[PDB]
Chains A and B, each alone.
Chain A
Amino acid sequence: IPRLDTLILVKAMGHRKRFGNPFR
């Protein structure tokens, strides 16, 4: 199973409309 933070990481990518680390 995935971690909660992994779900937030994926959401952020969707938010940026691009694959790849959405933070750094």
Chain B
Amino acid sequence: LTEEQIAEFKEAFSLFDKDGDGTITTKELGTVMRSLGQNPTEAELQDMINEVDADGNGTIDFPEFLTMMARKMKDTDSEEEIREAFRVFDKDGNGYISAAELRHVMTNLGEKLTDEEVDEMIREADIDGDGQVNYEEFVQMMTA
């Protein structure tokens, strides 16, 4: 356990915990989801909370959030997990991640990337130099 790790988890939690009251509500989740282009129903949002809500009180607190992370660090490799991740980027769903989409997704998730950083991130994964990242290239970067 390091200080830099805690800080990272703290800011991830803060992104969702809008009013900083120490809990993430279905309403707060909805806000972040909508800004990312997604449009879940109330039932879907509550479902998202319930799977991480260990004490079943209706909201997610820091310990539950941290536990979720620990469990996610165990397995990020399925297909459905990778596909799920790729789908977040591919906003329009045409099969490729463009620099514009990467920048938009990262900004709304609180990560400030420089134009140059965006391009380099894309370039490292762009196996066919077409300037985008398709599922295959995405999977190859994840599965290794």
Q: How many residues of chain A are within 8 Å of chain B by beta carbon?
A: 21
Residue B6 at the chain A interface, CB threshold 8 Å: no
**Interfacial residues, chain B to chain A (CB-CB below 8 A):** 8, 12, 15, 29, 32-33, 36, 38, 40, 44, 48-49, 51-52, 60, 68-69, 71-73, 76-77, 81, 84-85, 87-89, 105-106, 109-111, 113, 117, 120-121, 124-125, 133, 138, 141-142, 144
Interface positions of A from 1 to 24, Cβ below 8 Å from B: 1-12, 14-15, 17-21, 23-24
Q: Compute how far the CA of A11 lies from the CA of B12 in the bound complex, rounded to whole angstroms.
A: 8
Q: Compute how far the CA of A3 lies from the CA of B48 in the bound complex, rounded to whole angstroms.
A: 6
Q: Per DSSP, are chain B's interface residues mostly helix, strand or loop, or mixed?
A: helix
Q: Compute how far the CA of A4 lies from the CA of B38 in the bound complex, rounded to whole angstroms.
A: 13
